[PDB]
Scaffold this active site. Structure first.
Site, mmCIF file in Angstrom:
data_model
loop_
_atom_site.group_PDB
_atom_site.id
_atom_site.type_symbol
_atom_site.label_atom_id
_atom_site.label_comp_id
_atom_site.label_asym_id
_atom_site.label_seq_id
_atom_site.Cartn_x
_atom_site.Cartn_y
_atom_site.Cartn_z
ATOM 1 C CD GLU A 1 -7.111 -27.546 -11.689
ATOM 2 O OE1 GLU A 1 -8.061 -28.276 -11.324
ATOM 3 O OE2 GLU A 1 -7.139 -26.284 -11.598
ATOM 4 C CG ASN B 1 -17.282 -28.294 -11.357
ATOM 5 O OD1 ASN B 1 -16.307 -28.491 -10.644
ATOM 6 N ND2 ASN B 1 -17.198 -28.204 -12.683
ATOM 7 C CG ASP C 1 -21.791 -25.519 -12.152
ATOM 8 O OD1 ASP C 1 -21.360 -26.680 -12.302
ATOM 9 O OD2 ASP C 1 -21.278 -24.538 -12.723
ATOM 10 C CB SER D 1 -20.168 -28.021 -15.219
ATOM 11 O OG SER D 1 -19.542 -27.431 -14.094
ATOM 12 C CG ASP E 1 -13.761 -29.081 -13.506
ATOM 13 O OD1 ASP E 1 -14.586 -28.462 -14.209
ATOM 14 O OD2 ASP E 1 -13.237 -28.580 -12.481
HETATM 15 NA NA NA Z 1 -10.737 -27.682 -10.845
#
Ligand code: NA
Ligand SMILES: C[N+](C)(C)CCO
Ligand SMILES: C[N+](C)(C)CCO
Ligand SMILES: [Cl-]
Ligand SMILES: [Cl-]
Ligand SMILES: [Cl-]
Ligand SMILES: [Cl-]
Ligand SMILES: [Cl-]
Ligand SMILES: [Cl-]
Ligand SMILES: [Cl-]
Ligand SMILES: [Cl-]
Ligand SMILES: [Cl-]
Ligand SMILES: [Cl-]
Ligand SMILES: [Cl-]
Ligand SMILES: [Cl-]
Ligand SMILES: [Cl-]
Ligand code: NA
Ligand code: NA
Ligand code: NA
Ligand code: NA
Length: 129
Positions: free
Chosen positions: A35, A46, A48, A50, A52
């Site tokens: 990650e 992302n 969309d 958002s 992370d």
């Molecule tokens: Na991820």
């Protein structure tokens, strides 16, 4: 902060993550590797809208507030910036909620695609824990 493998394993154990919801420490270290490459400051947008955040790439769509994800939730009740700290407590506490929400570690697509089913104990091999 960029953790070493064994250093991160020890911090995760210190914060109650080893065998949390039945997931051994190697699973959590493997997820963090793919990650964030063990970097607490990692952020990724992302498609969309958002983002992370942190060592476990926790999404602002559901889990933290970043003020710019219209229509999202904040289920860990924390600013997303708190997930970037050198101290992993906030990321661990939130990950415990995520992994408890029904699908286990499959919530982390990189865990499903790169860690699930593999020899995850190799991630903690040799570590003094
Ligand atoms: Na991820
Ligand atoms: C809606 N999610 C399942 C993605 C998290 C909320 O529990
Ligand atoms: C080899 N790695 C260090 C990448 C994982 C543990 O075997
Ligand atoms: Cl860093
Ligand atoms: Cl280390
Ligand atoms: Cl396990
Ligand atoms: Cl393990
Ligand atoms: Cl995180
Ligand atoms: Cl928002
Ligand atoms: Cl919320
Ligand atoms: Cl906030
Ligand atoms: Cl820590
Ligand atoms: Cl499970
Ligand atoms: Cl999720
Ligand atoms: Cl070992
Ligand atoms: Cl060690
Ligand atoms: Na490594
Ligand atoms: Na949010
Ligand atoms: Na806003
Ligand atoms: Na195995």
């Amino acid at each position: 902060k960029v953790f070493g493998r064994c250093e991160l394993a020890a911090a995760m154990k210190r914060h109650g993550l080893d065998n949390y919801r039945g997931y051994s420490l190697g699973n959590w270290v493997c997820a963090a590797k793919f990650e964030s490459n063990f970097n607490t400051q990692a952020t990724n947008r992302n498609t969309d809208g958002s983002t992370d955040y942190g060592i476990l790439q926790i999404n602002s769509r559901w889990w933290c507030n970043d003020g710019r994800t219209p229509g999202s939730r904040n289920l860990c009740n924390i600013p997303c910036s708190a997930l970037l700290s050198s101290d992993i407590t906030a990321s661990v506490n939130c990950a415990k909620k995520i992994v408890s929400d029904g699908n286990g570690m499959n919530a982390w697509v990189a865990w499903r695609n790169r860690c699930k089913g593999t020899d995850v104990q190799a991630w903690i091999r040799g570590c003094r824990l």
